[PDB]
Amino acid sequence: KYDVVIIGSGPAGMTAAMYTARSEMKTLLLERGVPGGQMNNTAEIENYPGYETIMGPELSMKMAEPLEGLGVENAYGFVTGIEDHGDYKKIITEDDEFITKSIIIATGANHRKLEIPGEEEYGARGVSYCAVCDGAFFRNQEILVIGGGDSAVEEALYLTRFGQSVTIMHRRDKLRAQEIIQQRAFKEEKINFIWDSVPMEIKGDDKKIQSVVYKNVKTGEVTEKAFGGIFIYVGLDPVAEFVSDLGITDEAGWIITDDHMRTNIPGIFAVGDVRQKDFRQITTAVGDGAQAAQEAYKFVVEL
Amino acid sequence: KYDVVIIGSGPAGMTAAMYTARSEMKTLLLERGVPGGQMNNTAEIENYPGYETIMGPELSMKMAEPLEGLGVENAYGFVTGIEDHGDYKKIITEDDEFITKSIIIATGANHRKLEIPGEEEYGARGVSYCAVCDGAFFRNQEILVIGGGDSAVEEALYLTRFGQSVTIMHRRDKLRAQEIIQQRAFKEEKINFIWDSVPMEIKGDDKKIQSVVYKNVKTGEVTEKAFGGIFIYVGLDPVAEFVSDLGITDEAGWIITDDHMRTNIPGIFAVGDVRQKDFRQITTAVGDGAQAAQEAYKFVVEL
Numbered sequence: 001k002y003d004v005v006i007i008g009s010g011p012a013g014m015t016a017a018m019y020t021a022r023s024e025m026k027t028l029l030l031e032r033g034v035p036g037g038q039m040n041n042t043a044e045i046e047n048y049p050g051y052e053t054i055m056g057p058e059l060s061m062k063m064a065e066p067l068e069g070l071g072v073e074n075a076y077g078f079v080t081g082i083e084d085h086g087d088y089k090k091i092i093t094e095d096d097e098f099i100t101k102s103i104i105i106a107t108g109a110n111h112r113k114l115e116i117p118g119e120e121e122y123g124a125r126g127v128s129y130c131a132v133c134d135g136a137f138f139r140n141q142e143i144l145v146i147g148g149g150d151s152a153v154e155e156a157l158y159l160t161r162f163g164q165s166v167t168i169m170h171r172r173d174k175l176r177a178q179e180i181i182q183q184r185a186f187k188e189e190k191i192n193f194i195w196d197s198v199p200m201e202i203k204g205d206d207k208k209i210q211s212v213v214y215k216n217v218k219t220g221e222v223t224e225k226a227f228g229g230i231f232i233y234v235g236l237d238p239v240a241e242f243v244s245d246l247g248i249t250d251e252a253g254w255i256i257t258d259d260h261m262r263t264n265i266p267g268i269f270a271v272g273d274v275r276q277k278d279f280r281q282i283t284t285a286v287g288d289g290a291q292a293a294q295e296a297y298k299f300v301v302e303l
Numbered sequence: 304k305y306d307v308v309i310i311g312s313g314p315a316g317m318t319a320a321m322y323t324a325r326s327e328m329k330t331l332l333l334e335r336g337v338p339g340g341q342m343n344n345t346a347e348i349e350n351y352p353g354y355e356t357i358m359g360p361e362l363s364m365k366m367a368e369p370l371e372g373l374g375v376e377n378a379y380g381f382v383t384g385i386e387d388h389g390d391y392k393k394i395i396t397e398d399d400e401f402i403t404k405s406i407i408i409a410t411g412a413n414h415r416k417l418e419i420p421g422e423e424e425y426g427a428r429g430v431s432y433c434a435v436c437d438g439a440f441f442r443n444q445e446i447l448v449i450g451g452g453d454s455a456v457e458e459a460l461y462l463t464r465f466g467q468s469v470t471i472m473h474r475r476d477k478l479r480a481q482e483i484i485q486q487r488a489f490k491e492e493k494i495n496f497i498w499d500s501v502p503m504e505i506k507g508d509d510k511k512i513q514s515v516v517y518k519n520v521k522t523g524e525v526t527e528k529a530f531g532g533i534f535i536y537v538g539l540d541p542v543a544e545f546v547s548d549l550g551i552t553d554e555a556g557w558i559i560t561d562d563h564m565r566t567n568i569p570g571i572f573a574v575g576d577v578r579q580k581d582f583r584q585i586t587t588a589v590g591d592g593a594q595a596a597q598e599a600y601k602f603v604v605e606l
């Protein structure tokens with residue numbers, strides 16, 4: 001009944017949906033939230049070719065704009081499972097079932113947790129995984145940012161708009177982030193570093209965070225320092241629970257595809273951040289999405 | 304002396320160059336012509352995520368804009384060859400030589416010729432491979448477009464701005480173009496079709512084209528019909544002459560890569576339309592470019 005159902009309306013899904021709709025495939029695009037995916041949790045995007053710098057939620061709106069005029073059917077849905085019935089597939093959401101000849105899984109990735117004490121307790125109250133969401137709550141605070149990748153370092157630079165200082169705590173002595181971003185952080189006067197360190201405990205009063213205990217990974221030295229907020233950027237986990245049974249995931253839970261976005265299962269493709277891969281960017285999301293869309297067209301044509 | 308040299312400044316090269324420069328790689332971007340590649344020969348781009356519709360040369364300018372501020376060194380060059388000297392590579396242009404640790408080949412593809420009589424003779428004078436370049440010379444003419452793919456059909460739709468009529472001659476009875484574009488052509492009153500036909504001869508007076516002879520591929524029926532211009536869109540050939548010796552090309556001349564944009568030769572990558580692949584779009588150009596850029600960074604880091 002659908003030719004293709006795309007699950008997730010971040011940039012990979014949105015590109016896939018634009019491409020399938022342009023091939024006049026009967027196209028359903030399911031999204032649990034706001035179109036844009038991670039781009040809506042991104043302050044400034046500088047490396048999407050075509051735009052010099054653009055705010056994440058604006059790029060999200062621009063990518064979403066044409067979809068309805070192309071005849072993509074946009075619908076709310078949280079997908080909880082997928083069943084392979086051979087020559088069609090069923091997709092289960094909270095309240096619905098959808099039958100389709102093909103599926104493109106574009107559900108992305110989620111913030112990895114520290115799994116330390118205080119992290120859950122202070123969730124609403126000092127602990128954050130999203131600087132554009134929460135930064136303004138931390139005006140004039142000493143902010144801590146955990147991680148040494150692109151997100152940690154970019155989000156620390158963004159947060160300097162609000163905080164008195166932002167400290168980046170990284171578990172080695174060399175950042176993973178792109179050098180251009182490293183350099184901007186090195187030069188920014190409101191950015192401090194705690195190198196070779198990991199957080200051990202987030203502590204507070206029963207209302208909000210007050211301090212963090214951490215440890216040096218070369219010496220075991222333990223320090224406790226006051227902070228008013230902590231933003232955590234220690235990597236990603238896959239958003240793929242709805243296929244855990246199906247035999248298309250690696251040991252960490254990422255969806256395995258070949259180079260044409262194909263899983264094990266004929267007619268189920270996966271694109272973007274949810275796939276097993278190293279390089280997670282909007283460029284490769286868009287690329288993957290277009291490729292899967294063309295593979296779904298051919299699969300459905302042949303069916 | 305360069306960390307990376309990218310050859311060609313279409314969207315794949317431009318994305319690669321943006322990414323390498325952001326990793327602070329000493330980056331040279333060589334282009335024989337105008338930045339933009341094929342996008343500058345494209346009238347309206349509707350399927351680049353982020354833009355609802357944009358003229359090709361404008362998207363070209365937007366992609367080129369940030370490169371110099373990122374420290375990409377933009378230079379004129381027609382590359383004629385590449386030598387692998389093990390731990391560095393040399394690139395030869397008309398007048399220069401460049402030494403680099405890595406190379407990303409982003410030189411794209413060129414219009415395939417019909418290789419029929421009149422095609423060369425009327426090159427300047429009725430025969431064209433570029434509608435945005437030449438269309439306005441054909442105002443009120445009966446224009447012929449050869450091919451049944453995305454280019455033929457889109458470029459025929461564009462040309463209806465100028466011609467009295469545009470006829471699309473395709474060698475089968477079903478177009479290859481995206482269905483949305485097929486449908487727009489079917490509905491457009493100024494588009495006619497000559498199905499199941501191939502051109503045999505382009506004829507004219509010693510000044511300009513006047514007629515085309517063609518043949519029906521199911522019956523052998525031969526027809527000659529008057530036209531004032533012919534635009535040819537019968538597919539692509541690789542632009543890779545400068546590596547023909549090197550053992551990285553297939554029998555048709557496309558550059559073979561794995562899924563990380565790697566050739567046989569360590570430190571030489573290839574991206575975008577020049578690669579052996581099926582799906583040639585700006586989305587997959589940009590994707591390939593970003594991936595190669597990250598692979599070049601790692602290669603150079605390890606060297």
Ligand SMILES: Cc1cc2nc3c(=O)[nH]c(=O)nc-3n(C[C@H](O)[C@H](O)[C@H](O)COP(=O)(O)OP(=O)(O)OC[C@H]3O[C@@H](n4cnc5c(N)ncnc54)[C@H](O)[C@@H]3O)c2cc1C
Nearest residue numbers: 008010011012032037038078079107108272273280281282
């Ligand atoms: C802080 C930050 C800054 C970044 N900055 C950049 C940058 O500047 N440049 C860049 O190239 N990349 C950047 N990235 C990476 C980029 O955002 C991602 O690579 C990209 O968004 C991945 O797109 P996607 O479509 O695969 O997944 P996502 O954008 O994650 O979209 C997945 C979508 O699936 C939906 N979804 C998930 N589960 C379900 C379900 N069960 N049912 C229905 N819908 C569901 C989600 O709501 C989401 O909208 C950044 C990432 C972060 C966190």
Ligand SMILES: Cc1cc2nc3c(=O)[nH]c(=O)nc-3n(C[C@H](O)[C@H](O)[C@H](O)COP(=O)(O)OP(=O)(O)OC[C@H]3O[C@@H](n4cnc5c(N)ncnc54)[C@H](O)[C@@H]3O)c2cc1C
Nearest residue numbers: 311313314315335340341381382410411575576583584585
């Ligand atoms: C008429 C038309 C319409 C199109 N419309 C669309 C569309 O709407 N959407 C879409 O997604 N795709 C479209 N495409 C496809 C898209 O343009 C290409 O996929 C894309 O431009 C490929 O980018 P690239 O960087 O790999 O190669 P290119 O854009 O071809 O760029 C290659 C560059 O290399 C340079 N170069 C070549 N040889 C050398 C040399 N020896 N030394 C130095 N420089 C050199 C060239 O001058 C060129 O600038 C269209 C194509 C055509 C022809």
Ligand SMILES: NC(=O)c1ccc[n+]([C@@H]2O[C@H](COP(=O)([O-])OP(=O)(O)OC[C@H]3O[C@@H](n4cnc5c(N)ncnc54)[C@H](OP(=O)(O)O)[C@@H]3O)[C@@H](O)[C@H]2O)c1
Nearest residue numbers: 147148149150151152169170171176198233234235279280
């Ligand atoms: N501008 C952009 O293009 C952009 C922006 C944001 C994100 N992204 C992409 O999105 C993907 C995810 O990025 P990310 O930065 O969110 O994750 P990431 O690349 O996995 O980086 C996580 C960082 O946190 C470190 N870390 C992990 N645990 C830690 C701990 N317990 N204490 C201190 N530091 C810890 C990691 O250390 P190690 O380095 O030792 O592993 C790493 O440096 C990447 O592929 C990235 O390039 C891109």
Ligand SMILES: NC(=O)c1ccc[n+]([C@@H]2O[C@H](COP(=O)([O-])OP(=O)(O)OC[C@H]3O[C@@H](n4cnc5c(N)ncnc54)[C@H](OP(=O)(O)O)[C@@H]3O)[C@@H](O)[C@H]2O)c1
Nearest residue numbers: 450451452453454455472473474479501536537538582583
């Ligand atoms: N909007 C976009 O995304 C867009 C726009 C333009 C181009 N592109 C991409 O760029 C790539 C190249 O596109 P293209 O259209 O230039 O080439 P293409 O996909 O190779 O299509 C060429 C068309 O011409 C036909 N043909 C070949 N020889 C012929 C002859 N002698 N007489 C009549 N018809 C003949 C082919 O026939 P058969 O079909 O029988 O082979 C085919 O239909 C494609 O991958 C395409 O999708 C994309």
